[PDB]
Amino acid sequence: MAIDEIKSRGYLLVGLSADFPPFEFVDENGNIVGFDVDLAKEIARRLGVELKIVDMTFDGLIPSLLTKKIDVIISGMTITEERKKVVAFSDPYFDAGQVIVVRKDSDFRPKTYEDLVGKTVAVQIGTTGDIEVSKYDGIKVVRFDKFTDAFLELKRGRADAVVLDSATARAFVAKNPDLVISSGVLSSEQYGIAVRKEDTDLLEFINSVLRELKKSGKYDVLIEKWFSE
Numbered sequence: 001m002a003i004d005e006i007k008s009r010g011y012l013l014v015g016l017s018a019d020f021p022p023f024e025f026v027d028e029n030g031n032i033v034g035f036d037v038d039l040a041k042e043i044a045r046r047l048g049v050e051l052k053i054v055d056m057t058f059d060g061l062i063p064s065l066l067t068k069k070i071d072v073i074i075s076g077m078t079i080t081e082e083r084k085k086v087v088a089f090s091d092p093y094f095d096a097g098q099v100i101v102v103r104k105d106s107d108f109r110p111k112t113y114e115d116l117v118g119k120t121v122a123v124q125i126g127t128t129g130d131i132e133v134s135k136y137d138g139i140k141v142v143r144f145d146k147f148t149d150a151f152l153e154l155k156r157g158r159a160d161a162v163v164l165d166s167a168t169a170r171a172f173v174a175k176n177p178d179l180v181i182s183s184g185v186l187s188s189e190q191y192g193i194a195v196r197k198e199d200t201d202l203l204e205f206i207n208s209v210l211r212e213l214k215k216s217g218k219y220d221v222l223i224e225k226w227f228s229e
C-alpha cells in the first residue's frame with residue numbers, strides 16, 4: 001500500500017515547483033519554504049516519517065507522480081476536471097483565480113482575456129493560466145518553466161503581461177513596484193493535494209490531516225504565517 005511504501009523508505013516524497021510564493025519558494029537563505037512546505041511537514045510528521053521535497057518543473061509534477069517518482073504533489077495545484085481524469089485530489093485547501101499583471105508605467109490595463117488579443121503574454125507552462133490564454137488565438141503566448149523568468153520577461157518589456165494565480169501575483173507585485181495587477185480575479189480555483197488514484201489510504205490520511213489543521217486552529221496560524229509579509 002502507499003502508506004507502507006512511505007514507511008518502508010522512511011520519508012515522504014513531495015513534488016513541487018518552488019517558484020510560487022508564498023506556497024513554495026526559495027527564501028533569502030536559499031531554502032525551500034512556504035505554506036505548502038509546512039503542510040508537507042505536518043503530513044510527514046503525522047506519518048512518523050521524514051520529509052524529502054523533490055523540486056522540479058511544474059509541468060513535470062503529474063508525470064512524476066504517475067511514474068511513481070513522488071508520493072504526492074503539494075504545489076499550489078488547482079483541482080481541475082482534466083487533472084481528475086488521471087490523479088485524485090484531497091479536500092480543497094485554498095481559493096485563488098487568475099489575474100493579469102502588467103507594467104505600471106504603461107497605459108495598458110487589461111481586465112479580461114479578450115483584452116490580451118494582439119498582446120504577448122507570459123505564463124508558466126502547464127498551468128491553468130497557460131491553459132486559459134492558450135484558448136485565444138490572437139494572444140501571443142510565451143511559456144516559461146519558472147515564474148521568475150516570466151517576471152523578468154515582463155519587467156524588461158519583452159512581454160506585455162503575465163497571467164497567474166491571485167495570491168502569487170500579489171506576492172510578486174509586492175516586491176516589484178514597477179508592476180501592477182490590472183484585472184480582477186478571472187476564475188474560481190481551489191488548490192488540492194494530488195495523489196495517485198489507487199492510493200486511497202494516503203488520500204484519506206491527507207484529508208484527515210487537513211481537517212485536523214482546520215479544526216485545531218493551526219490552518220489559520222499557517223495562513224497568518226505566510227500571508228502577513
Ligand SMILES: NC(=[NH2+])NCCC[C@H](N)C(=O)O
Binds near residue numbers: 017075
Ligand atoms: N508551484 C507552482 N508553480 N504552482 C503553479 C500552480 C498554478 C495553478 N494553480 C495550476 O494548478 O495550474
